[PDB]
Amino acid sequence: GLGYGSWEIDPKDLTFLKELGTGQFGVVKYGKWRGQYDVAIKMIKEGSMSEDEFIEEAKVMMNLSHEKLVQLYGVCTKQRPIFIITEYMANGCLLNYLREMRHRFQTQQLLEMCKDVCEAMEYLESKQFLHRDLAARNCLVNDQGVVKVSDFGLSRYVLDDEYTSSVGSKFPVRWSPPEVLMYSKFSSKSDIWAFGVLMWEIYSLGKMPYERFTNSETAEHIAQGLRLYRPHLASEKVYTIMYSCWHEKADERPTFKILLSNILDVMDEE
Numbered sequence: 001g002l003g004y005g006s007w008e009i010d011p012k013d014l015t016f017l018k019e020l021g022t023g024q025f026g027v028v029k030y031g032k033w034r035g036q037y038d039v040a041i042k043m044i045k046e047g048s049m050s051e052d053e054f055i056e057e058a059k060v061m062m063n064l065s066h067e068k069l070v071q072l073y074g075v076c077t078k079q080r081p082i083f084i085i086t087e088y089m090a091n092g093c094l095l096n097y098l099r100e101m102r103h104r105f106q107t108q109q110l111l112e113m114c115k116d117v118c119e120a121m122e123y124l125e126s127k128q129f130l131h132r133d134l135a136a137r138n139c140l141v142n143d144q145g146v147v148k149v150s151d152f153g154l155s156r157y158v159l160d161d162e163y164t165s166s167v168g169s170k171f172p173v174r175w176s177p178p179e180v181l182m183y184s185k186f187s188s189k190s191d192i193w194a195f196g197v198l199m200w201e202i203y204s205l206g207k208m209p210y211e212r213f214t215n216s217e218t219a220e221h222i223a224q225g226l227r228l229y230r231p232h233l234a235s236e237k238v239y240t241i242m243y244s245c246w247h248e249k250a251d252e253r254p255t256f257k258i259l260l261s262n263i264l265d266v267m268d269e270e
């Protein structure tokens with residue numbers, strides 16, 4: 001079934017409609033399950049994933065469930081290529097959503113997007129689960145405007161070394177703390193850093209972090225003490241929150257639980 005019963009979904013119960021997304025991992029199609037329920041069908045391009053390891057871990061990820069986490073309904077592994085059946089989010093990736101000027105966002109909406117993501121990440125943290133590539137491109141927005149965290153943990157199965165090596169051309173350098181870029185030291189605190197950058201993306205309406213700097217320059221300068229400027233739409237109290245994610249010393253950065261409380265405090269003042 002869809003999130004109930006077998007986690008192996010029968011692809012004969014799926015209809016494959018419009019494409020929602022495409023990249024070096026595969027292609028994402030909108031679909032219906034038993035002609036009633038909307039789904040996003042993420043089909044894994046052969047040659048891109050450690051498929052055995054990925055299927056083993058998908059079974060465990062079936063147990064992750066939270067309102068602000070993109071729901072995994074199941075998988076289709078008895079064919080080539082394999083599919084992941086996931087929650088359909090009608091408004092697409094958060095990065096493009098932020099860049100659409102027609103939305104004319106209020107700052108109250110931007111803070112709520114931060115709350116949404118933070119609640120999802122507090123959940124993952126309580127499960128000792130790392131996202132490992134948190135960023136606006138990896139969040140989705142549903143038909144009601146709710147943001148949910150997507151593709152959490154997926155980078156563990158990507159074979160392309162340009163994307164998993166901290167020196168690779170596809171690595172999330174601009175979302176990584178210095179100890180990741182220097183020593184490959186991953187932890188909850190490197191998710192925390194990325195979340196700070198994600199808040200900066202949100203309040204910048206989707207601008208690229210450190211736009212005037214190359215990947216190599218960014219890595220060098222953030223280690224020296226460069227930090228992202230306060231976006232014009234971010235109040236001092238909002239900037240204080242995202243800035244706290246970027247302390248040089250990882251164990252000085254907050255937890256997602258503390259970040260969420262800070263975000264609620266700012267919301268509660270309206």
Ligand SMILES: CNC(=O)[C@H]1Cc2c([nH]c3ccccc23)CN1C(=O)[C@@H](Cc1cccc(C)c1)NC(=O)c1ccc2[nH]ncc2c1
Pocket residue numbers: 020021022023024025026027028040042043044045084087088089090091092093137138140151
């Ligand atoms: C490298 N990415 C990729 O290759 C493809 C396919 C795919 C993903 N993740 C996968 C996992 C397994 C197989 C294929 C993929 C992720 N992916 C997407 O375009 C993402 C946006 C995105 C993120 C990072 C980097 C880039 C370049 C694009 N969008 C969506 O995923 C999406 C967009 C609209 C939606 N509406 N509802 C749900 C939904 C989902």
Ligand SMILES: [Cl-]
Pocket residue numbers: 247248249252
């Ligand atoms: Cl410090």
Ligand code: NA
Pocket residue numbers: 210211212213
């Ligand atoms: Na810049």
